[PDB]
DNA sequence: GCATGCATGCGCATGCATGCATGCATGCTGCATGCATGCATGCGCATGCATGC
């Protein structure tokens, strides 16, 4: 088992192979593939003398219209990563994201029930259709992004809970399509505090080129004809999990 | 006229209908617990209208 890990560490094209092993079913879009890997790996958490906490999670937003293949990236991550959750904008309530309190039949105590953000602690939370979120939900997401805590005050229960999680979010342009003549802020529907703390914004735009269309169509038809014998990725999922686990234990 | 035995009251001893308090235990009952139930509340979200531009 260590034989394969030490073989991986040596190869001096390992970065390109790792990039080419992510979301193999999707065609192209290498920038998003790099971003997702960097988000699965992580940064460093630091603390100053004055108790100021320096954050070390990377947050990504993918912007495209309903035509673009932006949900396949999210479905790949929710199938690969160890602790990940998939939620959608209008099928989710605030209590289902932060937490809820229920009482025991045994009597004498209460119990907390975890939400999407708590079930993704030290992990990636996937949100599809970020633009259909309410301001009430966005104030909780902002609290999870600046602080790593969730505050509960309902029915006389006070509790501070840990949400150390990264955000993967997909957003639709405000008017269906992306206006190249406006700025990024003009095309999105987010609160200023939320937009500021996102690290990378990836915009997927369509181009009309014949050779790319031929390649894409060939790929799509190949998958239907040949089932799963149409990928031949450099690495497998079980191989990739082990490398990610090993990589997260280094402190540069 | 004298001697005798019976019936009449004294002079002991014992039992007996009334009557009332006390300590123990019975028997109920008012109190504290637990719980089902259904109406109201305090709340965040989605729609339709009014006011500009």
UniProtKB/Swiss-Prot annotation:
Binding site for ATP: 64-71
UniProt GO molecular function: ATP binding; ATP hydrolysis activity; DNA replication origin binding; single-stranded DNA binding; single-stranded DNA helicase activity
Motif Arginine finger: where in chain: 196-199
Main location: nucleus
Record flagged with keyword Repressor: no
Sorted UniProt keywords: ATP-binding, Cell cycle, DNA replication, DNA-binding, Helicase, Hydrolase, Nucleotide-binding, Nucleus, Phosphoprotein
Entry keyword annotation includes Nucleotide-binding: yes
Taxonomic superkingdom: Eukaryota
Family per similarity comment: Belongs to the MCM family.
Function comment: Acts as a component of the MCM2-7 complex (MCM complex) which is the putative replicative helicase essential for 'once per cell cycle' DNA replication initiation and elongation in eukaryotic cells. The active ATPase sites in the MCM2-7 ring are formed through the interaction surfaces of two neighboring subunits such that a critical structure of a conserved arginine finger motif is provided in trans relative to the ATP-binding site of the Walker A box of the adjacent subunit. The six ATPase active sites, however, are likely to contribute differentially to the complex helicase activity.
Subunit structure: Component of the MCM2-7 complex. The complex forms a toroidal hexameric ring with the proposed subunit order MCM2-MCM6-MCM4-MCM7-MCM3-MCM5; loaded onto DNA, forms a head-head double hexamer. Interacts with MCM10.
Additional information: Present with 13400 molecules/cell in log phase SD medium. Early fractionation of eukaryotic MCM proteins yielded a variety of dimeric, trimeric and tetrameric complexes with unclear biological significance. Specifically a MCM467 subcomplex is shown to have in vitro helicase activity which is inhibited by the MCM2 subunit. The MCM2-7 hexamer is the proposed physiological active complex.
Protein name: DNA replication licensing factor MCM6
Organism: Saccharomyces cerevisiae (strain ATCC 204508 / S288c) (Baker's yeast)
Organism lineage string: Eukaryota, Fungi, Dikarya, Ascomycota, Saccharomycotina
């Amino acid at each position: 088992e260590i034989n394969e890990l030490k073989e991986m560490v040596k190869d001096e094209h390992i970065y390109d192979k790792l990039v080419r092993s992510i979301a193999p079913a999707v065609f192209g879009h290498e920038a998003v593939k790099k971003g997702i890997l960097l988000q699965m790996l992580g940064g460093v958490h630091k603390s100053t003398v004055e108790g100021i906490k320096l954050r070390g999670d990377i947050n990504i937003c993918v912007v495209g219209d309903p035509s673009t293949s932006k949900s396949q990236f999210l479905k790949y991550v929710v199938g690969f990563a160890p602790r990940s959750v998939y939620t959608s904008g209008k099928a989710s309530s605030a209590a289902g994201l932060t937490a809820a309190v229920v009482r025991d039949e045994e009597g004498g105590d209460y119990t907390i029930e975890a939400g999407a953000l708590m079930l993704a602690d030290n992990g990636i939370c996937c949100i599809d259709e970020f633009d259909k979120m309410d301001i009430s939900d966005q104030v909780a997401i902002h609290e999870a992004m600046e602080q790593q805590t969730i505050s509960i005050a309902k029915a006389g229960i006070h509790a501070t809970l840990n949400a150390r999680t990264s955000i993967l979010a997909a957003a639709n342009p405000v008017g269906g399509r992306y206006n190249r003549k406006l700025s990024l802020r003009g095309n999105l529907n987010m609160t200023a505090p939320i937009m500021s703390r996102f690290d990378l914004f990836f915009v997927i735009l369509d181009d009309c080129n014949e050779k790319i269309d031929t390649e894409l169509a060939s790929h799509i038809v190949d998958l239907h004809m040949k089932r799963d014998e149409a990928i031949e990725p450099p690495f497998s999922a079980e191989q990739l999990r082990r490398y990610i686990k090993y990589a997260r234990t280094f402190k540069p």
